[PDB]
PDB file of all heavy atoms in Angstrom:
ATOM      1  N   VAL A   1    -144.362  -6.213 -83.514  1.00  0.00           N
ATOM      2  CA  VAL A   1    -143.536  -5.039 -83.751  1.00  0.00           C
ATOM      3  C   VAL A   1    -142.774  -4.671 -82.478  1.00  0.00           C
ATOM      4  O   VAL A   1    -143.292  -4.819 -81.379  1.00  0.00           O
ATOM      5  CB  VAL A   1    -144.409  -3.839 -84.185  1.00  0.00           C
ATOM      6  CG1 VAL A   1    -143.579  -2.565 -84.287  1.00  0.00           C
ATOM      7  CG2 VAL A   1    -145.104  -4.131 -85.511  1.00  0.00           C
ATOM      8  N   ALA A   2    -141.543  -4.197 -82.640  1.00  0.00           N
ATOM      9  CA  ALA A   2    -140.747  -3.694 -81.528  1.00  0.00           C
ATOM     10  C   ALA A   2    -139.924  -2.496 -81.992  1.00  0.00           C
ATOM     11  O   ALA A   2    -139.163  -2.587 -82.957  1.00  0.00           O
ATOM     12  CB  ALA A   2    -139.837  -4.783 -80.996  1.00  0.00           C
ATOM     13  N   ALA A   3    -140.088  -1.376 -81.298  1.00  0.00           N
ATOM     14  CA  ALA A   3    -139.398  -0.137 -81.631  1.00  0.00           C
ATOM     15  C   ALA A   3    -137.942  -0.186 -81.164  1.00  0.00           C
ATOM     16  O   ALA A   3    -137.665  -0.689 -80.079  1.00  0.00           O
ATOM     17  CB  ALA A   3    -140.115   1.037 -80.979  1.00  0.00           C
ATOM     18  N   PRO A   4    -137.012   0.362 -81.966  1.00  0.00           N
ATOM     19  CA  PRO A   4    -135.608   0.404 -81.578  1.00  0.00           C
ATOM     20  C   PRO A   4    -135.331   1.509 -80.572  1.00  0.00           C
ATOM     21  O   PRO A   4    -135.961   2.559 -80.637  1.00  0.00           O
ATOM     22  CB  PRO A   4    -134.901   0.757 -82.887  1.00  0.00           C
ATOM     23  CG  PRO A   4    -135.893   1.595 -83.616  1.00  0.00           C
ATOM     24  CD  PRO A   4    -137.246   1.051 -83.251  1.00  0.00           C
ATOM     25  N   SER A   5    -134.401   1.271 -79.648  1.00  0.00           N
ATOM     26  CA  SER A   5    -133.752   2.363 -78.937  1.00  0.00           C
ATOM     27  C   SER A   5    -132.654   2.871 -79.868  1.00  0.00           C
ATOM     28  O   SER A   5    -132.162   2.119 -80.725  1.00  0.00           O
ATOM     29  CB  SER A   5    -133.185   1.899 -77.597  1.00  0.00           C
ATOM     30  OG  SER A   5    -132.257   0.853 -77.778  1.00  0.00           O
ATOM     31  N   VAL A   6    -132.295   4.143 -79.735  1.00  0.00           N
ATOM     32  CA  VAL A   6    -131.360   4.778 -80.665  1.00  0.00           C
ATOM     33  C   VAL A   6    -130.237   5.485 -79.922  1.00  0.00           C
ATOM     34  O   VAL A   6    -130.454   6.082 -78.868  1.00  0.00           O
ATOM     35  CB  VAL A   6    -132.074   5.775 -81.600  1.00  0.00           C
ATOM     36  CG1 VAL A   6    -131.112   6.308 -82.654  1.00  0.00           C
ATOM     37  CG2 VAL A   6    -133.275   5.115 -82.261  1.00  0.00           C
ATOM     38  N   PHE A   7    -129.031   5.389 -80.476  1.00  0.00           N
ATOM     39  CA  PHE A   7    -127.837   5.955 -79.863  1.00  0.00           C
ATOM     40  C   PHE A   7    -126.959   6.535 -80.954  1.00  0.00           C
ATOM     41  O   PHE A   7    -126.759   5.894 -81.978  1.00  0.00           O
ATOM     42  CB  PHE A   7    -127.041   4.869 -79.129  1.00  0.00           C
ATOM     43  CG  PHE A   7    -127.848   4.093 -78.128  1.00  0.00           C
ATOM     44  CD1 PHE A   7    -128.535   2.947 -78.507  1.00  0.00           C
ATOM     45  CD2 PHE A   7    -127.909   4.499 -76.804  1.00  0.00           C
ATOM     46  CE1 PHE A   7    -129.277   2.230 -77.590  1.00  0.00           C
ATOM     47  CE2 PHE A   7    -128.647   3.778 -75.876  1.00  0.00           C
ATOM     48  CZ  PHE A   7    -129.333   2.642 -76.269  1.00  0.00           C
ATOM     49  N   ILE A   8    -126.430   7.735 -80.724  1.00  0.00           N
ATOM     50  CA  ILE A   8    -125.473   8.338 -81.643  1.00  0.00           C
ATOM     51  C   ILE A   8    -124.094   8.424 -80.983  1.00  0.00           C
ATOM     52  O   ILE A   8    -123.982   8.787 -79.814  1.00  0.00           O
ATOM     53  CB  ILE A   8    -125.946   9.726 -82.146  1.00  0.00           C
ATOM     54  CG1 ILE A   8    -125.099  10.177 -83.339  1.00  0.00           C
ATOM     55  CG2 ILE A   8    -125.916  10.772 -81.035  1.00  0.00           C
ATOM     56  CD1 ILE A   8    -125.678  11.356 -84.092  1.00  0.00           C
ATOM     57  N   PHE A   9    -123.057   8.085 -81.743  1.00  0.00           N
ATOM     58  CA  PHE A   9    -121.676   8.166 -81.285  1.00  0.00           C
ATOM     59  C   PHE A   9    -120.870   9.129 -82.160  1.00  0.00           C
ATOM     60  O   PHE A   9    -120.878   9.001 -83.389  1.00  0.00           O
ATOM     61  CB  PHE A   9    -121.026   6.785 -81.345  1.00  0.00           C
ATOM     62  CG  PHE A   9    -121.691   5.761 -80.464  1.00  0.00           C
ATOM     63  CD1 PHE A   9    -122.564   4.824 -81.001  1.00  0.00           C
ATOM     64  CD2 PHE A   9    -121.453   5.743 -79.099  1.00  0.00           C
ATOM     65  CE1 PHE A   9    -123.171   3.876 -80.193  1.00  0.00           C
ATOM     66  CE2 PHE A   9    -122.060   4.799 -78.281  1.00  0.00           C
ATOM     67  CZ  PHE A   9    -122.919   3.859 -78.827  1.00  0.00           C
ATOM     68  N   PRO A  10    -120.177  10.098 -81.538  1.00  0.00           N
ATOM     69  CA  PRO A  10    -119.285  10.963 -82.303  1.00  0.00           C
ATOM     70  C   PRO A  10    -117.973  10.258 -82.656  1.00  0.00           C
ATOM     71  O   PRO A  10    -117.674   9.203 -82.095  1.00  0.00           O
ATOM     72  CB  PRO A  10    -119.025  12.129 -81.351  1.00  0.00           C
ATOM     73  CG  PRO A  10    -119.188  11.551 -79.990  1.00  0.00           C
ATOM     74  CD  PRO A  10    -120.223  10.471 -80.110  1.00  0.00           C
ATOM     75  N   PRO A  11    -117.191  10.834 -83.582  1.00  0.00           N
ATOM     76  CA  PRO A  11    -115.880  10.283 -83.919  1.00  0.00           C
ATOM     77  C   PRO A  11    -114.850  10.543 -82.818  1.00  0.00           C
ATOM     78  O   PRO A  11    -114.939  11.558 -82.132  1.00  0.00           O
ATOM     79  CB  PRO A  11    -115.501  11.052 -85.188  1.00  0.00           C
ATOM     80  CG  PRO A  11    -116.194  12.364 -85.044  1.00  0.00           C
ATOM     81  CD  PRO A  11    -117.482  12.071 -84.332  1.00  0.00           C
ATOM     82  N   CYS A  12    -113.883   9.643 -82.660  1.00  0.00           N
ATOM     83  CA  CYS A  12    -112.845   9.795 -81.633  1.00  0.00           C
ATOM     84  C   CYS A  12    -111.651  10.592 -82.151  1.00  0.00           C
ATOM     85  O   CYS A  12    -111.486  10.763 -83.358  1.00  0.00           O
ATOM     86  CB  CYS A  12    -112.371   8.429 -81.135  1.00  0.00           C
ATOM     87  SG  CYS A  12    -111.702   7.369 -82.434  1.00  0.00           S
ATOM     88  N   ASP A  13    -110.817  11.057 -81.221  1.00  0.00           N
ATOM     89  CA  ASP A  13    -109.643  11.881 -81.546  1.00  0.00           C
ATOM     90  C   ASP A  13    -108.606  11.166 -82.417  1.00  0.00           C
ATOM     91  O   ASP A  13    -107.917  11.807 -83.212  1.00  0.00           O
ATOM     92  CB  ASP A  13    -108.960  12.374 -80.262  1.00  0.00           C
ATOM     93  CG  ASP A  13    -109.804  13.374 -79.484  1.00  0.00           C
ATOM     94  OD1 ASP A  13    -110.797  13.899 -80.034  1.00  0.00           O
ATOM     95  OD2 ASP A  13    -109.462  13.641 -78.311  1.00  0.00           O
ATOM     96  N   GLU A  14    -108.493   9.848 -82.261  1.00  0.00           N
ATOM     97  CA  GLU A  14    -107.507   9.061 -83.009  1.00  0.00           C
ATOM     98  C   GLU A  14    -107.830   9.016 -84.502  1.00  0.00           C
ATOM     99  O   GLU A  14    -106.972   9.295 -85.339  1.00  0.00           O
ATOM    100  CB  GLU A  14    -107.424   7.632 -82.460  1.00  0.00           C
ATOM    101  CG  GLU A  14    -106.928   7.533 -81.024  1.00  0.00           C
ATOM    102  CD  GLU A  14    -106.861   6.100 -80.527  1.00  0.00           C
ATOM    103  OE1 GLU A  14    -106.270   5.250 -81.228  1.00  0.00           O
ATOM    104  OE2 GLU A  14    -107.393   5.822 -79.430  1.00  0.00           O
ATOM    105  N   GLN A  15    -109.074   8.666 -84.819  1.00  0.00           N
ATOM    106  CA  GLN A  15    -109.527   8.527 -86.206  1.00  0.00           C
ATOM    107  C   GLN A  15    -109.456   9.843 -86.987  1.00  0.00           C
ATOM    108  O   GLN A  15    -109.152   9.841 -88.181  1.00  0.00           O
ATOM    109  CB  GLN A  15    -110.961   7.993 -86.233  1.00  0.00           C
ATOM    110  CG  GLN A  15    -111.474   7.592 -87.610  1.00  0.00           C
ATOM    111  CD  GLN A  15    -112.982   7.426 -87.636  1.00  0.00           C
ATOM    112  OE1 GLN A  15    -113.729   8.349 -87.303  1.00  0.00           O
ATOM    113  NE2 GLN A  15    -113.437   6.244 -88.026  1.00  0.00           N
ATOM    114  N   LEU A  16    -109.743  10.957 -86.313  1.00  0.00           N
ATOM    115  CA  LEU A  16    -109.761  12.274 -86.957  1.00  0.00           C
ATOM    116  C   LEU A  16    -108.449  12.606 -87.670  1.00  0.00           C
ATOM    117  O   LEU A  16    -108.458  12.967 -88.846  1.00  0.00           O
ATOM    118  CB  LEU A  16    -110.093  13.371 -85.937  1.00  0.00           C
ATOM    119  CG  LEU A  16    -111.551  13.431 -85.461  1.00  0.00           C
ATOM    120  CD1 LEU A  16    -111.684  14.315 -84.230  1.00  0.00           C
ATOM    121  CD2 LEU A  16    -112.471  13.922 -86.569  1.00  0.00           C
ATOM    122  N   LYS A  17    -107.329  12.453 -86.963  1.00  0.00           N
ATOM    123  CA  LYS A  17    -106.004  12.805 -87.503  1.00  0.00           C
ATOM    124  C   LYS A  17    -105.619  12.054 -88.788  1.00  0.00           C
ATOM    125  O   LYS A  17    -104.766  12.523 -89.544  1.00  0.00           O
ATOM    126  CB  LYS A  17    -104.919  12.600 -86.439  1.00  0.00           C
ATOM    127  CG  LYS A  17    -104.993  13.588 -85.285  1.00  0.00           C
ATOM    128  CD  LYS A  17    -103.822  13.416 -84.331  1.00  0.00           C
ATOM    129  CE  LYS A  17    -103.893  14.404 -83.178  1.00  0.00           C
ATOM    130  NZ  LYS A  17    -102.745  14.257 -82.243  1.00  0.00           N
ATOM    131  N   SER A  18    -106.241  10.899 -89.032  1.00  0.00           N
ATOM    132  CA  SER A  18    -106.027  10.134 -90.267  1.00  0.00           C
ATOM    133  C   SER A  18    -106.621  10.798 -91.519  1.00  0.00           C
ATOM    134  O   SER A  18    -106.266  10.427 -92.640  1.00  0.00           O
ATOM    135  CB  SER A  18    -106.609   8.725 -90.125  1.00  0.00           C
ATOM    136  OG  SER A  18    -106.094   8.075 -88.977  1.00  0.00           O
ATOM    137  N   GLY A  19    -107.524  11.760 -91.329  1.00  0.00           N
ATOM    138  CA  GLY A  19    -108.142  12.492 -92.439  1.00  0.00           C
ATOM    139  C   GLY A  19    -109.536  12.005 -92.799  1.00  0.00           C
ATOM    140  O   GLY A  19    -109.969  12.146 -93.944  1.00  0.00           O
ATOM    141  N   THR A  20    -110.240  11.435 -91.824  1.00  0.00           N
ATOM    142  CA  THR A  20    -111.612  10.964 -92.011  1.00  0.00           C
ATOM    143  C   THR A  20    -112.287  10.862 -90.648  1.00  0.00           C
ATOM    144  O   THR A  20    -111.648  10.512 -89.656  1.00  0.00           O
ATOM    145  CB  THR A  20    -111.651   9.603 -92.746  1.00  0.00           C
ATOM    146  OG1 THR A  20    -111.343   9.798 -94.132  1.00  0.00           O
ATOM    147  CG2 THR A  20    -113.024   8.939 -92.645  1.00  0.00           C
ATOM    148  N   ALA A  21    -113.577  11.186 -90.607  1.00  0.00           N
ATOM    149  CA  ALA A  21    -114.360  11.143 -89.376  1.00  0.00           C
ATOM    150  C   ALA A  21    -115.607  10.303 -89.602  1.00  0.00           C
ATOM    151  O   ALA A  21    -116.322  10.497 -90.585  1.00  0.00           O
ATOM    152  CB  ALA A  21    -114.739  12.548 -88.940  1.00  0.00           C
ATOM    153  N   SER A  22    -115.857   9.370 -88.687  1.00  0.00           N
ATOM    154  CA  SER A  22    -116.992   8.465 -88.794  1.00  0.00           C
ATOM    155  C   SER A  22    -117.955   8.707 -87.646  1.00  0.00           C
ATOM    156  O   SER A  22    -117.549   8.734 -86.489  1.00  0.00           O
ATOM    157  CB  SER A  22    -116.515   7.014 -88.779  1.00  0.00           C
ATOM    158  OG  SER A  22    -115.558   6.787 -89.798  1.00  0.00           O
ATOM    159  N   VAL A  23    -119.228   8.902 -87.976  1.00  0.00           N
ATOM    160  CA  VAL A  23    -120.271   9.090 -86.981  1.00  0.00           C
ATOM    161  C   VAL A  23    -121.157   7.860 -87.054  1.00  0.00           C
ATOM    162  O   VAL A  23    -121.573   7.463 -88.139  1.00  0.00           O
ATOM    163  CB  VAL A  23    -121.128  10.340 -87.269  1.00  0.00           C
ATOM    164  CG1 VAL A  23    -121.920  10.726 -86.036  1.00  0.00           C
ATOM    165  CG2 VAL A  23    -120.264  11.504 -87.749  1.00  0.00           C
ATOM    166  N   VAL A  24    -121.432   7.252 -85.904  1.00  0.00           N
ATOM    167  CA  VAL A  24    -122.167   5.996 -85.857  1.00  0.00           C
ATOM    168  C   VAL A  24    -123.531   6.189 -85.221  1.00  0.00           C
ATOM    169  O   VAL A  24    -123.659   6.833 -84.179  1.00  0.00           O
ATOM    170  CB  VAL A  24    -121.380   4.922 -85.081  1.00  0.00           C
ATOM    171  CG1 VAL A  24    -122.210   3.656 -84.906  1.00  0.00           C
ATOM    172  CG2 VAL A  24    -120.073   4.620 -85.796  1.00  0.00           C
ATOM    173  N   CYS A  25    -124.549   5.626 -85.862  1.00  0.00           N
ATOM    174  CA  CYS A  25    -125.884   5.578 -85.295  1.00  0.00           C
ATOM    175  C   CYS A  25    -126.280   4.117 -85.079  1.00  0.00           C
ATOM    176  O   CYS A  25    -126.196   3.303 -86.000  1.00  0.00           O
ATOM    177  CB  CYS A  25    -126.891   6.270 -86.204  1.00  0.00           C
ATOM    178  SG  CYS A  25    -128.509   6.464 -85.436  1.00  0.00           S
ATOM    179  N   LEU A  26    -126.715   3.811 -83.859  1.00  0.00           N
ATOM    180  CA  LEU A  26    -127.088   2.457 -83.468  1.00  0.00           C
ATOM    181  C   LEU A  26    -128.593   2.377 -83.247  1.00  0.00           C
ATOM    182  O   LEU A  26    -129.159   3.168 -82.494  1.00  0.00           O
ATOM    183  CB  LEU A  26    -126.355   2.059 -82.176  1.00  0.00           C
ATOM    184  CG  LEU A  26    -126.707   0.720 -81.505  1.00  0.00           C
ATOM    185  CD1 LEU A  26    -126.500  -0.452 -82.455  1.00  0.00           C
ATOM    186  CD2 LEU A  26    -125.889   0.517 -80.236  1.00  0.00           C
ATOM    187  N   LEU A  27    -129.236   1.430 -83.919  1.00  0.00           N
ATOM    188  CA  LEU A  27    -130.608   1.054 -83.613  1.00  0.00           C
ATOM    189  C   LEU A  27    -130.533  -0.309 -82.928  1.00  0.00           C
ATOM    190  O   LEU A  27    -129.963  -1.248 -83.483  1.00  0.00           O
ATOM    191  CB  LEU A  27    -131.454   0.977 -84.884  1.00  0.00           C
ATOM    192  CG  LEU A  27    -131.830   2.284 -85.596  1.00  0.00           C
ATOM    193  CD1 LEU A  27    -130.612   3.038 -86.106  1.00  0.00           C
ATOM    194  CD2 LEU A  27    -132.788   1.981 -86.737  1.00  0.00           C
ATOM    195  N   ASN A  28    -131.094  -0.415 -81.725  1.00  0.00           N
ATOM    196  CA  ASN A  28    -130.993  -1.638 -80.930  1.00  0.00           C
ATOM    197  C   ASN A  28    -132.291  -2.441 -80.818  1.00  0.00           C
ATOM    198  O   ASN A  28    -133.347  -1.878 -80.496  1.00  0.00           O
ATOM    199  CB  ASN A  28    -130.521  -1.301 -79.513  1.00  0.00           C
ATOM    200  CG  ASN A  28    -130.192  -2.538 -78.706  1.00  0.00           C
ATOM    201  OD1 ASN A  28    -129.324  -3.308 -79.093  1.00  0.00           O
ATOM    202  ND2 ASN A  28    -130.884  -2.739 -77.587  1.00  0.00           N
ATOM    203  N   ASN A  29    -132.176  -3.758 -81.034  1.00  0.00           N
ATOM    204  CA  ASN A  29    -133.235  -4.744 -80.772  1.00  0.00           C
ATOM    205  C   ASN A  29    -134.651  -4.330 -81.236  1.00  0.00           C
ATOM    206  O   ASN A  29    -135.538  -4.084 -80.424  1.00  0.00           O
ATOM    207  CB  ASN A  29    -133.221  -5.141 -79.279  1.00  0.00           C
ATOM    208  CG  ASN A  29    -132.185  -6.237 -78.956  1.00  0.00           C
ATOM    209  OD1 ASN A  29    -130.961  -6.052 -79.084  1.00  0.00           O
ATOM    210  ND2 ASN A  29    -132.685  -7.380 -78.487  1.00  0.00           N
ATOM    211  N   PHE A  30    -134.850  -4.285 -82.555  1.00  0.00           N
ATOM    212  CA  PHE A  30    -136.123  -3.878 -83.149  1.00  0.00           C
ATOM    213  C   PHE A  30    -136.658  -4.902 -84.146  1.00  0.00           C
ATOM    214  O   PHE A  30    -135.903  -5.727 -84.647  1.00  0.00           O
ATOM    215  CB  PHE A  30    -135.966  -2.515 -83.830  1.00  0.00           C
ATOM    216  CG  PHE A  30    -134.992  -2.506 -84.979  1.00  0.00           C
ATOM    217  CD1 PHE A  30    -135.439  -2.659 -86.277  1.00  0.00           C
ATOM    218  CD2 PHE A  30    -133.630  -2.334 -84.762  1.00  0.00           C
ATOM    219  CE1 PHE A  30    -134.553  -2.650 -87.340  1.00  0.00           C
ATOM    220  CE2 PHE A  30    -132.738  -2.326 -85.818  1.00  0.00           C
ATOM    221  CZ  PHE A  30    -133.200  -2.482 -87.112  1.00  0.00           C
ATOM    222  N   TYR A  31    -137.964  -4.841 -84.416  1.00  0.00           N
ATOM    223  CA  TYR A  31    -138.612  -5.622 -85.483  1.00  0.00           C
ATOM    224  C   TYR A  31    -139.820  -4.847 -86.024  1.00  0.00           C
ATOM    225  O   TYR A  31    -140.566  -4.274 -85.239  1.00  0.00           O
ATOM    226  CB  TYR A  31    -139.094  -6.994 -84.982  1.00  0.00           C
ATOM    227  CG  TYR A  31    -139.591  -7.871 -86.118  1.00  0.00           C
ATOM    228  CD1 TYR A  31    -138.721  -8.710 -86.807  1.00  0.00           C
ATOM    229  CD2 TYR A  31    -140.919  -7.818 -86.541  1.00  0.00           C
ATOM    230  CE1 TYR A  31    -139.162  -9.485 -87.868  1.00  0.00           C
ATOM    231  CE2 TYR A  31    -141.369  -8.590 -87.600  1.00  0.00           C
ATOM    232  CZ  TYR A  31    -140.489  -9.422 -88.260  1.00  0.00           C
ATOM    233  OH  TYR A  31    -140.931 -10.187 -89.315  1.00  0.00           O
ATOM    234  N   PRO A  32    -140.054  -4.866 -87.354  1.00  0.00           N
ATOM    235  CA  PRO A  32    -139.324  -5.554 -88.425  1.00  0.00           C
ATOM    236  C   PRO A  32    -137.976  -4.943 -88.789  1.00  0.00           C
ATOM    237  O   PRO A  32    -137.600  -3.898 -88.264  1.00  0.00           O
ATOM    238  CB  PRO A  32    -140.287  -5.475 -89.621  1.00  0.00           C
ATOM    239  CG  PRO A  32    -141.159  -4.306 -89.340  1.00  0.00           C
ATOM    240  CD  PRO A  32    -141.304  -4.257 -87.850  1.00  0.00           C
TER     241      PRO A  32
END
């Protein structure tokens, strides 16, 4: 077993003006 490190990214200024916002969550190098 290996626990993930976790990172959250907010949406950028460019994407917002298009009429949609994406928030990204990253789980890094984990098992299972």
Side-chain angles (χ1 to χ4, degrees):
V1 174
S5 58
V6 186
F7 306 89
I8 193 167
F9 299 101
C12 59
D13 292 346
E14 296 180 50
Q15 189 195 57
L16 287 166
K17 291 185 180 181
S18 306
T20 286
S22 305
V23 196
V24 174
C25 189
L26 174 58
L27 288 63
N28 189 60
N29 277 64
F30 63 96
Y31 188 89

